[PDB]
Design a protein around this ligand. Structure first.
Ligand SMILES: Nc1ncnc2c1ncn2[C@@H]1O[C@H](COP(=O)(O)OP(=O)(O)OP(=O)(O)O)[C@@H](O)[C@H]1O
Ligand SMILES: [Mg+2]
Ligand SMILES: [Mg+2]
Lengths: 985, 147
């Protein structure tokens, strides 16, 4: 009963069973500050059964530093009572409640218990109960730029999936008598030692087809070992192996037991001596709060730091921790005890929400057990951070002023950022900017652009949008929502509806891009990322890239003249199957899905486009007869869709669908088996239909069968949609119409001048003239995966499964068909929160203008295994030009709009280089090998005039520069790379 | 991108391909028209075949789109000009030059691969009735590939 219209992207990460088990779990959340509200939001968007909140503390002003469901009108009201109403709107399937008082036995009502903003004594009291009653217990804490997570799921936690990866499967070439299983040519199984596999469709060793998992002993990248198969047989030929995943038993320890001997998780390997320090420091914080009526150390206060360090010494002595305490780091923890940052809150909230989902669904490998994190590299160094600057000012930014100071707050308030995209990461980034106070000053401004509209499936991870906002523009809704969150951003946010690309340079030009301070990408495709990266490189602006894929995520920072750009890195490209594999010899469901998509496009889209273009373009036939690859195909499509096979009623559509069934699933297979019989052999004597080639078999139309009827219904409905007829769904009419069908005879044909032009002319003159058909247009079918009533995925699924039945491939359901055909990217709210937190932690480094490259950190993480890693950015490569140091990426030549000859002379005389190629955009302006007449005609023209002449397009009035790529040779003839040229028009 | 394309173009200019001639269309660096001469020891002897090469924006990180323009009677080449070359679909790596692609296509024309065909009828004719395949190939290369 999962609402797949809303959880579409999340089901591809978790699954149906995981979400079914998740929708029966109760979560209690103690503490409703920024971290607690982030956890509650992520849990509500995830889809647990219910959420209960407990926070009777009255609201204060500083709480607004990271609580985005609190307004200044709520001062003096308990935080839970004012957060429940706003949390109840995120998801309609997840009720949210509030408890005035919490008793121990009450905890038995819940499946998971999350604890924040609670003293250590109360945490021990809660955990002593939630441990022996088998209740998952997560405790999270956030102090300044430091964070801690602790997980305790019981002594007998069962983890079904330990990495989140799909089970490994592959094809076998041969299995020897000693269990040595070999993969096909250039195919790597990818198995690791200790895995279990099950074999199917094995020839010569039927015993391995029983299904019993067997051990794996990897022997190489292509072969492995399974043990002894002597009894079953001597040798096995071909077959498919599939990995088997076995549940694991994980044993946790209680908080009281794990205080003395903790088990750490290291988010970074460059600093592995710190977690032992943080373990003492946080306990000392709890003791200090207990000894001062719950008052944490004052910001940048030396007396409190000294007392806190004395508490740390006492704790380290009591626990017999044989670790020397780092005074500077501990005192730093003391200074930022009252800090409350939205970036740290978002990061830890995403992590803790993922831990909650692990506890409820018994999936993925959890943290075990202590996770201590810090981003101390973000602390500003170009401003004064002392007791005087960090004291609270009685404003909503107190939690951030207590870490960064008032001067850095004024630096933040004057930012002029540019956010590209308004998806999930865009919404999180806008929330973080609103909470941090970005662009709330006189000179601040925010610009957000996105050309898409809100859909139902987007509401599962984009929390700024509501079901009443479905169908509206993302940028406007996001700007309005974040102006609601922070009233000071009224009039400081501008929302566009423009796609960032070559066509939008009239809006995002020099004037727009020269006032910015940084650019943040929230895109989902590589082309736009590359374009924005090139624009930032040209204008020399800092860039923040961030990406997610299911539970994986990464963040990268590009700094002018310091690090390399985004395009300097290469990612694994997409895999496209060979045309010969798709056309005739498929062996996986992906091949059949691709074939079905091509069939859909070629049946309902291309012929309609040709018909429409014929009835509109007056001279279309002449152009097609000498331009299109197959003019005969175009003419046949036009004839068939205009006169020959034009339906007058839906019954004719049904008959057409039956005919297409015969055409594509019964006759082409007969032709293929006539060309290559099942008993044919290759040139080397081996049987043809062996290995990656599976012998097909024609399908006979059986109306009672489900797949045949589904294909008929989908095809007839789509044809009627093309011709604008009235579709129906009652099986009675289909069974009545298809009963009286006589299949036309078909026999495969063995084969055995300028008359073809005569036949083409005869076909052409048979077509109706455009004048006789005025206003008659056929509606094409534009692929749309997200609508379930257009019969698109239904048709693709039916065709794919029928072709699988042809080749005895295992058919897939509509869920997997929609995942594969639609190129859906799995997405989660927790990953979005984590990447937004990391990006906003890098943003404060960018604001402070840090110069050293070791102070920035590109981040990568995988939440399925609890892996976090941070690495320094790659420095921009240097080069030697004319005995001078030149940055490859961030250097350019500035020249006037001089003639081509003057440009060549300047390069010859100044740089001592001989120009051999000069191009602009995609055009070759000048080449050393061109005939002399062309050069003599082109040399004395200005660069702008030359570009206008060659590109056959006048320069737009808003064009103010030209980017030229130049390749030149040295005096000796050796090639030398040089930066691009920036001609100033 | 542009620099690599121009380097390949200059290399073709510096060293003649003899059996091929590739160059940009008009003044566009991302659209080339190449010419291939039929091998002497093949039915396509004395023929000129025109190929259209479309360089993707992500070149050389994505394969160029090479499509025949002249009609050819070959088991691995269909009626739309698509070529069954492994180095152009998923084996592509940013280390292959256009001269290598043209040499591979010439070798493909030298001897087809009927065990993994793209046009099953032509492959069947080639495997069973060789003389008819030769006659059809000569007829096609005389009707389309000449003049
Ligand atoms: N070139 C571009 N210029 C501006 N905005 C862009 C560009 N390309 C993509 N976007 C926007 O980036 C955002 C990407 O967010 P996201 O991928 O989460 O949403 P979606 O693609 O609509 O959803 P889904 O992928 O889940 O179906 C979308 O708003 C999309 O409109
Ligand atoms: Mg969308
Ligand atoms: Mg998307």
């Amino acid at each position: 009963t999962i609402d797949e219209g809303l959880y579409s992207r999340q089901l591809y990460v978790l699954g149906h069973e995981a979400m079914k088990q998740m929708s029966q779990s109760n979560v209690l959340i103690i503490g409703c500050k920024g971290l607690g509200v982030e956890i509650a939001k992520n849990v509500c968007l995830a889809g647990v059964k219910s959420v209960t909140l407990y926070d009777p503390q009255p609201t204060r002003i500083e709480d607004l530093s990271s609580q985005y469901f609190l307004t200044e009108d709520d001062i003096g009201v308990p935080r839970a009572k004012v957060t429940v109403s706003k949390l109840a709107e995120l998801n309609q399937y997840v009720p949210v409640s509030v408890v005035d008082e919490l008793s121990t036995e009450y905890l038995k009502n819940f499946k998971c218990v999350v604890v924040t903003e609670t003293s250590l004594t109360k945490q021990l009291e809660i955990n002593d109960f939630t441990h022996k009653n088998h209740i998952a217990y997560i405790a999270a804490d956030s102090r300044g730029l430091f964070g801690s997570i602790f997980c305790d799921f019981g002594e007998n936690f069962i983890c079904t999936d330990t990495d989140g990866n799909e089970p490994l499967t592959g094809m076998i070439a041969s299995i020897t008598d000693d269990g040595v299983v070999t993969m096909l040519e250039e195919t790597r199984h990818g198995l690791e030692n200790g895995d279990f596999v099950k074999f199917t469709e094995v020839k010569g060793m039927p015993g391995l087809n029983d299904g019993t998992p067997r051990k794996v002993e990897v022997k190489g990248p292509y072969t492995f070992s399974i043990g002894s198969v002597k009894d079953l047989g001597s040798a096995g030929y071909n077959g498919v192996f599939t990995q088997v995943k076995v549940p694991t038993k994980i044993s946790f320890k209680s908080l009281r037991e794990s205080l003395k001997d903790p088990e750490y998780v290291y988010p970074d390997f460059g600093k592995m001596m710190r977690p032992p320090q943080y373990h003492i420091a946080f306990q000392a914080l709890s003791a200090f709060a207990d000894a001062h009526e719950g008052s944490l150390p004052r910001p940048r206060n030396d007396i409190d730091a000294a007392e806190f360090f004395e508490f740390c010494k006492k704790i380290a002595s009591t626990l017999q921790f044989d670790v020397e305490l780092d005074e500077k780091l501990i005192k730093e923890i003391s200074y930022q005890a009252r800090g409350d940052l939205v970036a740290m809150s978002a990061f830890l909230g995403g992590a803790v929400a993922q831990e909650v989902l692990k506890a409820t669904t018994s999936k993925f490998y959890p943290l075990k057990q202590y996770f201590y994190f810090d981003s101390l590299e973000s602390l500003p160094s170009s401003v004064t951070i002392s007791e005087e600057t960090c004291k609270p000012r009685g404003c909503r930014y107190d939690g951030q002023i207590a870490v960064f100071g008032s001067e850095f707050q004024e630096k933040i308030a004057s930012l002029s950022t540019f956010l590209v995209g308004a998806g999930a990461i865009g919404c999180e980034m806008l929330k973080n900017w609103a909470m941090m106070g970005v662009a709330t000053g006189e000179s601040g401004h925010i610009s957000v652009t996105d050309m898409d509209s809100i859909e139902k499936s987007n509401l599962n991870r984009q929390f700024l949008f509501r079901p009443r906002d479905v169908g509206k523009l993302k940028s406007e809704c996001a700007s309005t929502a974040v102006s609601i969150m922070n009233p000071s951003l009224t009039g400081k946010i501008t929302s566009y509806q423009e796609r960032v690309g070559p066509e939008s340079e009239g809006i995002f030009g020099d004037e727009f891009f020269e006032k910015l301070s940084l650019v943040t990408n929230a895109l989902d495709n590589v082309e736009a990322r590359m374009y924005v990266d090139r624009r930032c490189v040209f204008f020399e602006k800092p860039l923040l890239e961030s990406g997610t894929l299911g539970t994986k995520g990464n963040t990268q920072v590009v700094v002018p003249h310091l690090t390399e750009s985004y395009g300097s890195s290469q990612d694994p490209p997409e895999k496209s199957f060979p045309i010969c594999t798709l056309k005739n010899f498929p062996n996986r469901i992906e091949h059949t899905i691709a074939w079905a998509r091509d069939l859909f496009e070629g049946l309902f889209k291309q012929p309609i486009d040709n018909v429409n273009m014929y009835l509109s373009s007056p001279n279309f036939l002449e152009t097609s007869l000498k331009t299109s690859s197959n003019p005969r195909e175009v003419l046949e499509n036009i004839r068939d869709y205009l006169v020959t096979e034009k339906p007058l009623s839906f019954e004719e559509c049904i008959m057409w669908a039956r005919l297409q069934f015969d055409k594509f699933f019964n006759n082409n297979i007969q032709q293929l088996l006539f060309n290559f019989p099942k008993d044919s052999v290759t040139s080397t004597g081996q049987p043809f239909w062996s290995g990656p080639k599976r012998a097909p078999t024609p399908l006979s139309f059986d109306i009672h069968n489900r797949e045949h009827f589904d294909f008929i219904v989908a095809a007839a409905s789509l044809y009627a949609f093309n011709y604008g007829l009235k579709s129906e769904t009652d099986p009675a009419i289909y069974e009545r119409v298809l009963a009286g069908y006589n299949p036309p005879p078909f026999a495969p044909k063995s084969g055995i001048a300028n008359k073809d032009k005569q036949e083409l002319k005869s076909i052409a003159d048979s077509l109706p003239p455009p004048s006789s058909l005025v206003g008659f247009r056929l509606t094409p079918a534009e692929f749309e995966k997200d609508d379930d009533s257009n019969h698109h995925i239904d048709f693709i699924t039916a065709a794919s499964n029928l072709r699988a039945m042809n080749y005895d491939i295992t058919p897939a359901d509509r869920f997997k068909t929609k995942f594969v055909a639609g190129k859906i990217v799995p997405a989660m709210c927790t990953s979005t929160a984590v990447v937004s937190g990391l990006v906003c932690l890098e943003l404060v480094k960018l604001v402070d203008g840090k110069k050293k490259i070791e102070e920035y950190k590109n981040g990568f993480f995988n939440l399925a295994i609890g892996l976090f890693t941070f690495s320094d950015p790659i420095a921009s490569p240097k080069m030697k030009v004319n005995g001078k140091e030149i940055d490859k990426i961030w250097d350019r030549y500035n020249l006037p709009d001089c003639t081509l000859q003057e440009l060549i002379d300047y390069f010859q005389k100044e740089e001592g280089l001989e120009v051999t190629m000069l191009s602009s955009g995609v055009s070759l302006l000048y080449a050393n090998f061109q005939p002399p007449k062309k050069l003599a005609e082109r040399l004395p023209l200005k660069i702008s005039e030359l570009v206008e002449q060659i590109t056959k397009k006048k320069l737009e009035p808003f064009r103010k520069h030209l980017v030229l790529e130049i390749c030149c040779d040295d005096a000796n003839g050796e090639d030398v790379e040089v930066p691009f040229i920036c001609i100033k028009l | 991108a542009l620099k690599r394309i121009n380097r390949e173009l200059a290399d073709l200019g510096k060293d003649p391909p003899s059996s091929s001639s590739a160059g940009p269309v008009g003044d566009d660096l991302f659209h080339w028209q190449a010419t291939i001469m039929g091998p002497a020891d093949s039915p396509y002897a004395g023929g000129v075949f025109f190929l259209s090469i479309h360089f993707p924006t992500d070149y050389p990180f994505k394969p160029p789109k090479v499509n025949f323009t002249t009609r050819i009677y070959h088991p691995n080449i269909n009626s739309n000009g698509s070529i069954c070359l492994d180095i152009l679909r998923d084996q592509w790596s940013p280390a292959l030059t256009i001269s290598k692609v043209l040499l591979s296509i010439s070798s493909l024309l030298t001897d087809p691969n009927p065990d993994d065909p793209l046009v099953p009828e032509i492959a069947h004719v080639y495997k069973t009735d060789r003389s008819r395949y030769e006659l059809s190939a000569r007829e096609w290369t005389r009707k389309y590939a000449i003049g």
